[PDB]
Structure formats: C-alpha cells, structure tokens
Paper text:
Chorismate mutase/prephenate dehydrogenase from [name] Rd KW20 is a bifunctional enzyme that catalyzes the rearrangement of chorismate to prephenate and the NAD(P)+-dependent oxidative decarboxyl­ation of prephenate to 4-hydroxyphenylpyruvate in tyrosine biosynthesis. HinfPDH is a dimeric enzyme, with each monomer consisting of an N-terminal α/β dinucleotide-binding domain and a C-terminal α-helical dimerization domain. The [name] protein family comprises dehydrogenases that are dedicated to l-tyrosine biosynthesis. In the prephenate pathway, PDH enzymes catalyze the NAD(P)+-dependent oxidative decarboxylation of prephenate to 4-hydroxyphenyl­pyruvate (HPP), which is then converted to l-tyrosine by an aminotransferase.
The crystal structure of the prephenate dehydrogenase component (HinfPDH; residues 81–377) of this [name] enzyme was determined in complex with tyrosine and NAD+ at 2.0 Å resolution and represents the first PDH structure from a bifunctional [name] enzyme. The structure reveals key active-site residues at the domain interface, including His200, Arg297 and Ser179 that are involved in catalysis and/or ligand binding and are highly conserved in [name] proteins from all three kingdoms of life. In HinfPDH, tyrosine is bound directly at the catalytic site, suggesting that it acts as a competitive inhibitor. The His200 imidazole is hydrogen bonded to the 4′-OH of the bound tyrosine. Ser179 hydrogen bonds to both the ribose O atom of nicotinamide nucleoside and the 4′-OH of the bound tyrosine and is important for orientating prephenate and NAD+ for catalysis. The Arg297 guanadinium forms a pair of electrostatic interactions with the tyrosine carboxyl, which also interacts with Gln301 from the α8 helix. Compared with other [name] enzymes, HinfPDH lacks an α–β structural motif between α2 and β2, the loop between β5 and β6 (Lβ5–β6) is much shorter, and an extra helix α12 is found at the C-terminus. Furthermore, HinfPDH adopts a more closed conformation compared with [name] proteins that do not have tyrosine bound. An ionic network consisting of Arg297 (a key residue for tyrosine binding), a water molecule, Asp206 (from the loop between β5 and β6) and Arg365′ (from the additional C-terminal helix of the adjacent monomer) is observed that might be involved in gating the active site. The Arg365′ side chain adopts dual conformations, with one con­formation participating in the ionic network and the other pointing away from the active site. This dual conformation may be part of the gating mechanism, in which an ionic network forms on closure of the active site after substrate is bound and is broken when the product is released.
Residue numbers in the entry:
A (entry chain B): 92 to 371
B (entry chain A): 92 to 311, 316 to 371
The structure:
C-alpha cells in the first residue's frame, strides 16, 4: 500500500502490461490507488475502448516492437494524456512519442529487472519529452515506492548505456559462452568456492535466466555499441600479450595504472562487496 | 576467543606472518590459544631461535618466493613438526614441502582475501601431504572459526583453479583495463546504476584494490585464456553479421549449460542486494 500522489488520475493503461516489467509497474500503480487497464499482444481489437478516457499510457513492450507500437497508439491519444515508456533505449522512443502525441511525454528506463523484491534504492532514468510539470506527480509516486530518479537527455542516456549495458552484457555473455565450452562441472567449481568466488560465477550465470531478446536488442541498438565491443577484443589481445611474453612487470605496471583510473572507488568497492557478503 | 582444539601445541611459526593472509591466520590462531612467532622478510638472521621448538610452521609468502622459502626452512625443521602452507597453487608447493620435511605435511589454500570480517562460510581447500592423523586437530580448529574444509588432491586443486581463479581474474583484469581506456567518468556511470549495475562495476574495480603481484603469479591457464580470446571472436560475429537469432540461440544453449543454477544465481544475487 502506497500513498496516492495524484487522485485526479482515474485510468492508467499499460501497453504490454502482462509482461514482466509492465506487470511489475501495474502492481505498484494499483497498490498506489490507480486503476490499471492492460493492453497486451492479443488486445488490439479493443484498443479503442481500452484507451478511451485514459489519463496515462505507458509502453512496456519488446524493444524491437516499441516504435511500431507507439505509432499504433496514435489514433487514440488525446492532448490531456501523459504518454510514457519503460524502454531500455531512449533517443528513438522519445522522438517517436513526441511525434505521435501533442501532450505530455516522459521517457523512463528502470535500471532493474522485474524480479526485484522492492523498489528501495533502485534507479529509474528520467528523460523529459514535453510538459514535465504535468508528470511530476508520477516521478514523485515512483519515489514513494523508494526508487531514485536520475535525469539525463535521451542521447546522453543511450551514450552511457553503450558502456553500462551494451559493453557489460556483451562481456558477461562472452564469459558465460566460454565457460559453457569448457570441460568442467559447475557444481565441482562451486564446492571449492567461498562466497566471493560463488558471486563471481553468479554474476555470469544470472544473465542467462533472463530474456535473450532483451540483451540482443540492447547490444544491437546502435553502431557505437559494436564499436565499443570491438575495442574490448583489442584490449583482451593487449592483456594476453603480457602472459604470452611472461612479462610480469608489464602486467603489474598496467594493473597499477588501472587502479589509478578507478581511484578510491577500488577500495570502496572492495569494502562494499565484503559488507554485502558478510550480511548475506 | 575460540576453543583450543589441541592444547599440546605450544608454538606455531608463521613465515610471512606480517603479511595480509599470514597476519590474519596469526590473529585467528592467537585467539584460539596458540602461541605465535613470526618469521618475515627481515627475520632470517635470527631464524634459528624463531624456529626453535616449533610444533608447526606455516608458509604464507608471495607465490613467486614460496618454493625457495620452503627450501630455506630445511635446516631448522625436525620430524615432529607439522609443515603447511597457504599458497594459491598446490602441486609444486606440496611436493617441495614433502621433499624438505620428513614429518607431517599439509597443503592449504584459503579461498579468500585478508579483509574478511569473519571466517563464517569461507572455504579452505585441503590437499594432504603426509600423516593426516597428525593434523586433524588443525582442520577442526579452522572449522571452529566457521570455515568449511573441502578436500582434493593438489593436481585437481590446481586444475580447478585454472577456471576459478586464472580465467576469472584474467578476464576481470582485461575488462578493467578496457574500461580504463574509455571516454567516460566512473562517477557518472555510478549515478545511473541501480544496485545490480553498481555491483557489475564493483566486481571489476575491487580487483585493483588488491596486490598486482598476487594475481600476476596466480594467472601465470594460458590455454584457457587463449580460448576465451577465441570465444570473444565467435560472440562478436553475431553482432558484426547482425545475426540476432544466432545470438538468441547461443544464449539459450548457455542457459542450458548452467541449468537451474541460472535461476538460483538470479535469486541469490537479488537476496544479497536486498539485505544490503
Ligand atoms: N525485464 C527487464 O529486466 C527490463 C528492464 C528494463 C526495461 N525493460 C523494458 O521492458 C520492455 C520489455 O518488456 P519485459 O522485459 O517485461 O518482457 P516481456 O516479454 O515479459 O513483456 C513484454 C510484453 O509485451 C507484450 N507484447 C508483445 N507485442 C505486443 C504488442 N504488439 N502490443 C502490446 N503488447 C505486446 C508481450 O505479450 C509481453 O507481455 C522493453 O521496453 C525493455 O527495454 C525490461
Ligand atoms: N591476500 C590474499 O587474498 C590471498 C588469498 C589466498 C592465499 N594467499 C596467499 O598468501 C601468500 C602471501 O601473500 P599475502 O597475500 O598475505 O601478501 P603480503 O605481501 O601481504 O604478505 C607476504 C608477506 O611475506 C613477507 N615476505 C616476503 N619475502 C619473505 C621471505 N623471504 N621470508 C619470509 N617472509 C617474506 C612479506 O614481508 C609479507 O609480510 C601467498 O602464498 C598467496 O597465494 C593470499
Ligand atoms: N541487467 C539487469 C536487468 C535489466 C535489463 C535491462 C535493462 O534495460 C535494465 C535492467 C539485471 O541483470 O538484473
Ligand atoms: N579473489 C579473492 C581474493 C583471493 C585471492 C587469491 C586467492 O588464492 C584466494 C582469494 C577476492 O577478490 O576477494
């Protein structure tokens, strides 16, 4: 149960609302006192009646269907409505929402999966479209759940996701792929693993419990993503050289330079990770 | 304070005892009622008196100095002593301990760093050298502190460390190296990061807070890192060829290799972060 920030909101439609993320937001919104209607894959025959008199429309469909879904909403949108999305990429969905709708437009990116037990300390990225004064209530509602909002423009958002998501999930993918080809039994590795070592494997394996299509569409979104993963391969080759050459001091010098780049974050991360495992 | 499993142990010598791991073991053993003498980098001129009447000698020096350090102990060792190590590699240190000492010999590998706040649920690998009946007390003592003992031979230990340590730390090293060359500011990435995404970066940056020498010696294994290089290529090909279904099919096959561990790891990681 959560405080209802805006009691003048009488109907919220979630497009893709039987999905994992859309469903999660539907639950949180219902628990905050807002009536929710769902428009999912088999409901378009009655889109007109589902969307009729909506105050808010939220789009949470597969990345590769998002832009066509936004266009499909066009005939049913009225100017008083808020149009928003939850998509992992922002530049193109935000531009498309602003093109199809003349009213308030808000881009969101929840930086978490649908398996969260609570919204406490989870981050949602805010990219303004139009009329932010009309949707302040929704940003405040999300914070009532305990989430934190961070604001960027949609282009900067996607630029940062190049590193945060495309690079990182590509890398984890390659690590899991590699492990899967090795002549080893995972349970044998786990028996020798203390908590930190178990967590090393968990951070790789947990990726594969999720939807392949999500990670495919994130990584494939733009040519900057291909470019950054091509450079990861070049760096892997550079790192390898130290071990082929048995150049222990070269490795150490590089390790020390990388520590200076992290700065005090290296020691903070060591501490945070230890505390995470100690409690648990 | 921990229960003293064996009250007949009157002197334990830790070679490398002012170090991070040696110092940690010295603190646990002192707290378990065992008198500790330290033999560190400067102390070899008085090694005769340090090692005199020792019941146990534990080696905890840099990996690259470990075998020559064991060799250097031979003149001060007597048959009744227990000789043991904490080294991250087991096959060469164990053999060299069996070579220079006629008495009880035990190989240990603590699977953790010195910054632990307790031994609860930490793993120590056990590789028997000689006369395990003589050192059961110490295996029990370590468990009194809350650690788990897992037993293997030194060859199988070393084989598993290829994957658990060499592979994983090399890959984390290459990822931090790569990140350090990107046109980004870490604080800015962190401000967009929910707890799971902060942990993605934490798991890389925390490597670099530790001793570069340790990871250099552990990694230097080459085969598995060279094959990782081959897998990076296969993975990249999906994105270069815009082969989405290929990627999805490969992702599904990896999930099947992890089996139910994928979902268990998703749950464990969620729980770890929610507790925080
Ligand atoms: N699950 C996550 O970790 C996560 C995290 C952040 C953002 N997102 C975003 O959520 C969206 C994907 O949703 P999900 O991850 O919950 O996956 P999902 O597959 O579980 O949900 C997607 C839903 O959209 C529905 N759908 C498909 N075509 C439709 C159509 N034409 N009209 C209406 N509904 C349609 C599906 O039936 C499904 O219920 C993407 O925008 C993605 O970037 C997901
Ligand atoms: N630190 C870890 O996370 C970790 C984990 C598991 C195992 N280990 C093992 O710990 C051992 C020691 O490393 P540490 O991590 O505590 O690093 P460290 O540098 O803190 O400790 C090494 C100690 O050995 C001393 N030393 C150097 N040369 C010596 C010599 N000739 N004779 C006696 N002492 C000497 C140093 O002065 C120092 O006090 C290695 O065998 C390593 O594999 C370390
Ligand atoms: N990467 C997150 C889930 C997620 C996926 C895609 C996103 O856009 C955001 C979050 C996790 O593994 O838990
Ligand atoms: N890898 C552990 C520390 C460690 C290092 C070497 C070892 O042999 C064992 C454990 C960590 O990052 O916390």
């Amino acid at each position: 149960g959560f405080k209802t920030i805006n009691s003048d909101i009488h109907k919220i439609v979630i497009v893709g609302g039987y999905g994992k993320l859309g469903g999660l937001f539907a639950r949180y919104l219902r628990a905050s006192g807002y009536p929710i209607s769902i428009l999912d894959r088999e409901d378009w025959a009655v889109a007109e009646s589902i969307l009729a008199n909506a105050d808010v429309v939220i789009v949470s469909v597969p990345i590769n269907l998002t832009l066509e879904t936004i266009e499909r909403l066009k005939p049913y949108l009225t100017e008083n409505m808020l149009l928003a999305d939850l998509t992992s990429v922002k530049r193109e969905p935000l531009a498309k929402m602003l093109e199809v709708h003349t009213g308030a437009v808000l881009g969101l990116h929840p930086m978490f999966g649908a398996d969260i037990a609570s919204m406490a300390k989870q981050v949602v990225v805010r990219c303004d479209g139009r009329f932010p004064e009309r949707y302040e209530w929704l940003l405040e509602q999300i914070q009532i759940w305990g989430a934190k909002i961070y604001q960027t423009n949609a282009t900067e958002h996607d630029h940062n996701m190049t590193y945060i998501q495309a690079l990182r999930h590509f890398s984890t993918f390659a690590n899991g792929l590699h492990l899967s080809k090795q002549p080893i039994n995972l349970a044998n590795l786990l028996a020798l693993s203390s908590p930190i070592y178990r967590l090393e494997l968990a951070m790789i394996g947990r990726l594969f419990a999720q939807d392949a299509e999500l990670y495919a569409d994130i990584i494939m979104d733009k040519s900057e993503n291909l470019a950054v993963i091509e450079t990861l391969k070049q760096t892997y080759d550079e790192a390898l050289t130290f071990f082929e050459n048995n150049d222990r001091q070269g490795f150490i010098d590089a390790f020390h330079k990388v520590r200076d780049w992290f700065g005090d974050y290296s020691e903070q991360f060591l501490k945070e990770s230890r505390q995470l495992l100690q409690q648990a």
